Each structure stands twice: as C-alpha cells, then as structure tokens.
Design a protein around this motif. Structure first.
Motif: not given
Ligand SMILES: [K+]
Length: 317
Positions: A91, A106-107, A109, A118
């Motif tokens: 993450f 920041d993908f 998750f 994050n």
């Molecule tokens: K993430």
C-alpha cells in the motif's frame, strides 16, 4: 528520452537508485503477529540494524512503546500512526520522476487504515503533495529497470482490475514506459517480486527450481523460457528446500530482496542456497554489499523482506 504526455515527462525509478528512506510498518500486538510477536520483532530489529548502517530508516507504528525496541539504533526515525497491515510494499506510496521532480503516487488499494497511513505520512512528516491515481496496484506487483521497461505478472493486474491492452496502455502512461513484460508462468496477492526482479538495467534475477519432484519445477521452468525470450541477461535464484510452519509450506523466495544505498539485502532461510544466491548476486553487483537477513519468521504471514518495506528516493521534491 524526452517524451511528454498530457503535460508530463515521466521516468520510472529502479530500486537501486539513491534513496532517502526505507520505510516499514512495525508489527504490533493487535494484528496477526500476536503468537510470535517477539519473534518477528527480533527479525525486524536485525533487518533495521542492517539497513540503518547504509541509509535512514523510518518506522511507522500506532504507539510510542512500539518504537521503544528500536530507540538505540542510529539513523532510525519514528512516526506515530495507526495501522495493522505491516506489508507496506502493498500500500505504500510509489515514487516517479515527473518533469524533473520526484513525485509520490498513491494508488487505490483493497483497506481503511492503510489507505489513510499515506495521507498522514505525507501531510504531517514530508509535508508534500500526494498524487492519488485511481487504479488498483500493489508495489510488489511491478518491477522497473529504469530504462522504460517494467516487469509484471498477468495473473496480478488483470485479476485486480478493462482490456489487457488498455491496462498495458494505462500503465505505460502512468510510468512513462516503452515496454511491459507480462509474465504468464511461474509462482511461489500474486506478486512479481516473488518471482523475478531487475538487478541492473540489463539483468533479471529469477526464481528457479532444480528438483523435478517439486510442484514449482514446471511453472518455474516455463517462466524461465518466457524470460529467455526477453533478451535480458538472466541470473537464477534456486528456491530452498521446503520450509514449514504448522504443517503449511512457506513461500520462501530469494527474489524478495531489497536494494538500498550501496547494498542489496537478501532473505536467508538457513538453506545451502543462501550462500549460492549471495555469491551469485554479489559477483553480478560489483558495487553493492550483499547482506543476508534471516527471513523465516516473515514467511509465517506470507511475505518476506521486500514485502515489508518501501523505498523513498532521494532528489528534488
Ligand atoms: K495505496
């Protein structure tokens, strides 16, 4: 080189580029590390001690008492923040170079605390913009050579996320890539960092199995053949003999190493292959110190060294 798309020139970063931090999320008496809490924490302490000799380490945990065990170690910083999942590679924020500045992505998750972790980190500590990308991707599912090529498994990203051609195109746009190698075969969340990794711009280190009786033999032999088609130099990482915890076979893999400044930290499993992979990787990486860290306890929760950390690269932000 000088390619721009929708306002941005993007370069993907290989793990061996210079770094500012290695980031980890400590196990605590709340997640699923309870039975062997002191066990894994001792592993962490060893891992942290090794890394801290080469670059700064940032440890993330809910309580100040969690940090107590690492207070004596030089170059170790701490950041108060609630969590449960320790596999920060899943993450954590992923750096790219965007128009000459490092920028963290920041993908999405799949989650809760980790998703927040994050934001807190970037808002409070780094005080930095955190570009959210609406796309499902774990850090362990991709690997970069730093020349526009990315390595990944077909089983990961097609499952998580809607053509492959579309996913391929989207991923190339996000990371400024010229090529994606989609691996069909082999195994040990499915992750490329358990199977195959670039160790320099020209070379891929990959799991292999020498015992024909073992269930890994043919999948890894097929993966080998695929990798032979890419043209990259290949370095083999023979899996150790079967390891077990409570009658369950652990996914021990030497591919879950981590690059840090001037060093490559490799998982050791107390098998003769520890020595084989360390000498092999060491010879192939003449400007790195290759250091084995006992990773057996990590495997109880289905991950190893690379899965438990995230790299934050050095440069202009
Ligand atoms: K993430």
């Amino acid at each position: 080189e000088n390619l721009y798309f929708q306002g941005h020139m993007i370069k993907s970063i290989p793990e061996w580029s210079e770094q500012e931090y290695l980031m980890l999320s400590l196990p605590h008496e709340k997640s699923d590390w309870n039975p062997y809490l002191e066990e894994i924490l001792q592993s962490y302490k060893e891992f942290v001690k090794v890394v801290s000799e080469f670059q700064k380490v940032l440890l993330i945990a809910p309580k100040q008492s969690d940090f107590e065990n690492f207070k004596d170690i030089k170059n170790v910083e701490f950041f108060k923040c609630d969590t449960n999942d320790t596999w920060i590679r899943d993450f954590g924020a992923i750096d790219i170079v965007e128009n000459g500045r490092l920028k963290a992505l920041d993908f999405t998750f799949n989650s809760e605390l980790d998703n927040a972790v994050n934001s807190k980190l970037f808002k409070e500590k780094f005080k930095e913009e955190l570009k959210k990308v609406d796309f499902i991707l774990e850090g362990g599912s991709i690997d970069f050579n730093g020349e526009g090529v990315m390595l990944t498994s077909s089983h990961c990203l097609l499952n998580e996320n809607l053509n492959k051609t579309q996913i391929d195109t989207k991923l190339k746009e996000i990371f400024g890539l010229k090529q994606i190698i989609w691996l069909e075969n082999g195994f040990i969340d499915h992750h490329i960092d358990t199977l195959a990794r670039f160790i320099d711009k020209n070379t891929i280190a990959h799991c292999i199995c020498e015992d024909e009786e073992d269930e890994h033999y043919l999948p890894l032999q097929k993966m080998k053949e695929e990798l032979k088609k890419t043209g990259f130099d290949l370095l083999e990482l023979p899996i150790p003999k079967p390891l077990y915890y409570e009658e369950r076979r652990l996914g021990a893999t030497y591919a879950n190493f981590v690059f840090i400044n001037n060093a490559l930290i490799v998982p050791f499993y107390k098998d003769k292959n520890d020595e084989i992979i360390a000498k092999r990787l060491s010879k192939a990486l003449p400007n790195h110190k290759i250091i084995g860290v006992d990773a057996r306890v990590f495997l109880r929760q289905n991950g190893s060294l690379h899965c438990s950390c995230q790299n934050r690269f050095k440069g202009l932000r």
